[PDB]
Design a protein around this ligand. Structure first.
Ligand SMILES: [Mg+2]
Ligand SMILES: [Mg+2]
Ligand SMILES: [Mg+2]
Ligand SMILES: [Mg+2]
Ligand SMILES: [Mg+2]
Ligand SMILES: [Mg+2]
Ligand SMILES: [Mg+2]
Ligand SMILES: [Mg+2]
Ligand SMILES: [Zn+2]
Ligand SMILES: [Zn+2]
Lengths: 36, 100, 67, 91, 206, 53
RNA sequence: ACGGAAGGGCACCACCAGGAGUGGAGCCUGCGGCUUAAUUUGACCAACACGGGGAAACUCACCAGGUCCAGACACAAUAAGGAUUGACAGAUUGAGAGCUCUUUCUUGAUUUUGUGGGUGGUGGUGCAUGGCCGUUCUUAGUUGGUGGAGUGAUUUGUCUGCUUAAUUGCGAUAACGAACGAGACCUUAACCUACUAAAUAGUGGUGCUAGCAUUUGCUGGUUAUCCACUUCUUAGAGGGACUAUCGGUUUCAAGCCGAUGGAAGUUUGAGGCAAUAACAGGUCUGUGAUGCCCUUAGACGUUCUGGGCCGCACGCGCGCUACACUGACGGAGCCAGCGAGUCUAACCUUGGCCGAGAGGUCUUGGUAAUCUUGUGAAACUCCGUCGUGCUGGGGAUAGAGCAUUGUAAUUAUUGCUCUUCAACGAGGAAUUCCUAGUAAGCGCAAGUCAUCAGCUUGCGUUGAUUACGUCCCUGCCCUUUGUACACACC
């Protein structure tokens, strides 16, 4: 039942394979990116 | 005059003896020093199975046995006479290995 | 038993029908002569045919027989 | 099946560069023996375009064999954007 | 690898090739393969009734078969090569006859006509006896079995391993499977290897 | 998910399979055949196992 | 076809004569029943240590739950302001599972949603099937061509009698001539101072060398100490037996019965193969063999965790261990065959050391007539302790501990140590197997195997009694015969 909320039309971390398109998400005290 | 050992192994005794006789005749017509063809004991690889593909009927068994006959012949020959004897035994069904 | 089959008896008949001024009642000479006059595909069969031929020669020597 | 586009491109590259693929029947093998791709990925990319055509398959003791055809040559030529002179290795 | 395991695996490899070529070259009239192992490269001799569809246009088919076997059995490229020359006699191969009649049945043909055609061809190709058994749901019934035999057939003893060619096929009819058993009693006279007659056959010179 | 889609299969009946039919039962492991007993009965002559006695 | 009809022949899956038993006990294992969430299921002479079925996980099919799509593709609705995929932490869950949610990052026409069509299924149907097997039937049986008989089904051929293991032959003869089966054949186990050859086999004596004895002899190490040889060992081409010779018995023969000879005289012993017709025999749970029916995303697909398959008022089958003195125990003797075994990795292990043991550790040899291995097997032999009692027979049950395999030993995997020491006093009615290197006793190797034999497959060590027959019982073959049977006396 994975919904995949639409996320209609809309910073950085280590592992430089994350090339400036890995904008972080901040829930609370989060330093973890989308790739990891 | 390098000392080599030729190992012949096959399931077909007829062709095994054919190749062994070819090599012995070659050695005798080229006047080498050869240890005779030693016939190492034929090994009867038997495997026992149940005839039925299920569990029904009289318990009738089979042994399928495959005889692997192997011979070894070690002699002394120069490089030309080892190359020629290792290129002349190309008989199918016999595995021939030359070890120096 | 030791009942000789048709394959042996008929062969012995034919051998004796064409080779009577030939092999005597000795089994060894009978079989060695079968070796040359007949293409028998097994040593056991040639032994049996030669033995029956020797038997028939021996029974001829006591008087003739049918066949 | 959902497999990455570059993995599918690797499967297509291999298929058009040697012509035929031999695949273990193991939908769990991590990496294909010759292709740097999941064995499941190879098998299912072929259960893919094979059904469109482009491939003949034979099972033969649990080991898939896939062979390329003429329509397959055309399809992979177009897919990989190749000039009409790079024949498969089989030719 | 020890000699036992190596020649066992050699037999296994030959069996695997035989099944592969049965499934691949069925419509090409495949009849059997021969694996010759040489010090430098391995030659795979295919015996087929039609060695032109096995080869293909300019050798495409045989080349793809070579590279398929290459990749499957993991040889260095170039170390294995296929030659599909010819079958000595189409009518004397049980595999070839069974596959041909399977194909006739699949294409749609009377069982009796197809089997008697196979038997007649085998008999006129010099065989001293042939038999075809077609078993199954020939018509909607309790799945009877028909036999179509000509000549004589010794079965069995040692001479049956000596010279009897037996092949079995599974034919897929729209109602289930038909079973094909093809048995050929080749002429012992033209053996060209091994015994030239039956063990009990005695010939006398005079 | 992908982390748990398999537990060890390094021994036992589930580690092996008939190289012809992928059957786990009745396997032949002698001499490394790895062929089910029924498949082996079907194609022993191709392998070279014959009946003599 | 059948007969509680006849005639002849035959079979230890029959009996006689006997042997070893099983049925009586403990335990093992399968089957039923009961129980259960499930205790998956097939099979009822020819099911029941059978499914190679010795299930901890896997296998697995069953049970309680949990993921994934491994739903190709022709199609239309979602999509270039992102279809869809993954996700850290926490809830949540057995689970560090992003299953789902909290929340907003990542990926980008690789899939989602609906339609059709596919795909997998140890799902059903073995009474839809193939293939394979088992059985009818381990007997000797079966079938054309042409001729003969009959309206015909059909019959003769294919037989009165002798003979044979045999439809094997002698022969007889409206049949002649043939085909399959049997036999022939192949594999093996016996002999062969015959040929060929062998530090991957062995022996003499020469090197070297210990002991003992010393007039030079015995025992033996000399695994690179050379020569000679092939008797033992191995394996190729062959030899050898064909019931040979002789007596007697035979219808006229096929043969038979003795004796000698001979390695071997029952088809030389043991097998492999093995006809015509069948069975609603087993197998859809071996198969990517398979028709149809069922299901196919909350899966009957597949995977994962746990459980079960083993469960216990009871009945049955195959087994093992026993009930003891022809024995138990302890020392010492020290005798096989058939086999298996690891190179991209973990198999068979010698030897050393650690340990009481099981076992551990350091090396070694072996891809093998090379090393494990002379598999230094067990019964058995010798000498002692026991001394007839449920005993020092038996070893079930159970407690404690220590190792081993395994991701994981709980419902004890196995092994080892100590301890508890049950039934069982030779076994009802019944019923099994068996005739000579056989029965029976004994262990070993292999198969299943990560670990697990009381199982099977083969192998050898020790090795009887009885009989050399019969048709009484149970069956089979042939012939005649009766039949109201043909689904064929169930
Ligand atoms: Mg026979
Ligand atoms: Mg007992
Ligand atoms: Mg399933
Ligand atoms: Mg007539
Ligand atoms: Mg008749
Ligand atoms: Mg039934
Ligand atoms: Mg069970
Ligand atoms: Mg009655
Ligand atoms: Zn990052
Ligand atoms: Zn199999």
């Amino acid at each position: 039942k994975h919904k995949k909320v639409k996320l209609a039309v809309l910073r950085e971390c280590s592992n430089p394979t994350c090339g400036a398109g890995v904008f972080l998400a901040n829930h609370k005290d989060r330093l973890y990116c989308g790739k990891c | 005059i390098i000392k080599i050992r030729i190992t012949l192994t096959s399931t077909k005794v007829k062709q095994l003896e054919n190749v062994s006789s070819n090599i012995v005749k070659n050695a005798e017509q080229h006047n080498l020093v050869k240890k005779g063809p030693v016939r190492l004991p034929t090994k009867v690889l038997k495997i026992s199975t149940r005839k039925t593909p299920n569990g029904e009927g009289s318990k009738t068994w089979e042994t399928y046995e495959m005889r692997i006959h192997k011979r070894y012949i070690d002699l002394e020959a120069p490089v030309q006479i080892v190359k020629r004897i290792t290129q002349i035994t190309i008989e199918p069904g016999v595995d021939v290995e030359v070890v120096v | 038993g030791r009942v000789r089959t048709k394959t042996v008896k008929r062969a012995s008949k034919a051998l004796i029908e064409r080779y009577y001024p030939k092999l005597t009642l000795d089994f060894q000479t009978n079989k060695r002569l079968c070796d040359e006059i007949a293409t028998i595909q097994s040593k056991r069969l040639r032994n049996k045919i030669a033995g029956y031929t020797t038997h028939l020669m021996k029974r001829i020597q006591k008087g003739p027989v049918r066949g | 099946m959902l497999m990455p586009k570059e993995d599918r491109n690797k499967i297509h590259q291999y298929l058009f560069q040697e012509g035929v693929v031999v695949a273990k029947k193991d939908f769990n093998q991590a990496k294909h023996e010759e292709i740097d791709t999941k064995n499941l990925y190879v098998i299912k990319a072929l259960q893919s375009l094979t059904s469109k055509g482009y491939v003949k398959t034979q099972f033969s003791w649990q080991y898939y064999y896939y062979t390329l055809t003429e329509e397959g040559v055309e399809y992979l030529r177009e897919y990989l954007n190749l000039p009409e002179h790079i024949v498969p290795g089989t030719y | 690898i020890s000699k036992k395991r190596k020649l066992v695996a050699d037999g296994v490899f030959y069996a695997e090739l035989n099944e592969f070529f049965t499934r691949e070259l069925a419509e090409e009239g495949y009849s059997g393969v021969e694996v010759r192992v040489t010090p430098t490269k391995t030659e795979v001799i295919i015996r087929a009734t039609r060695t032109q569809d096995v080869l293909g246009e300019n050798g495409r088919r045989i080349n793809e078969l070579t590279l398929l076997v290459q990749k499957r059995f993991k040889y260095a490229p170039g170390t294995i090569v296929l030659y599909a020359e010819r079958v000595q006699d189409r009518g004397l191969s049980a595999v070839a006859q069974a596959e041909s009649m399977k194909f006739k049945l699949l294409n749609g043909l009377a069982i009796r006509r197809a089997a008697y055609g196979v038997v007649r061809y085998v008999m006129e190709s010099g065989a001293k006896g042939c038999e075809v058994v077609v078993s199954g749901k020939l018509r909607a019934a309790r799945a009877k079995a028909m036999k179509f035999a000509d000549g004589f057939l010794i079965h069995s003893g040692q001479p049956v391993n000596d010279f009897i060619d037996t092949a079995t096929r599974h034919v897929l009819m729209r109602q289930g499977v038909l079973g094909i058993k093809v048995k050929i009693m080749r002429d012992p006279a033209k053996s060209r290897t091994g015994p030239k007659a039956l063990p009990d056959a005695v010939t006398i010179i005079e | 998910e992908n982390v748990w889609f398999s537990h060890p299969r390094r021994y036992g009946k589930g580690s092996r399979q008939c190289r012809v039919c992928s059957s786990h039962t009745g396997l032949i492991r002698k001499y490394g055949l790895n062929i089910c007993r029924q498949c082996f009965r079907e194609k022993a002559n191709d392998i070279g196992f014959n009946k003599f006695r």
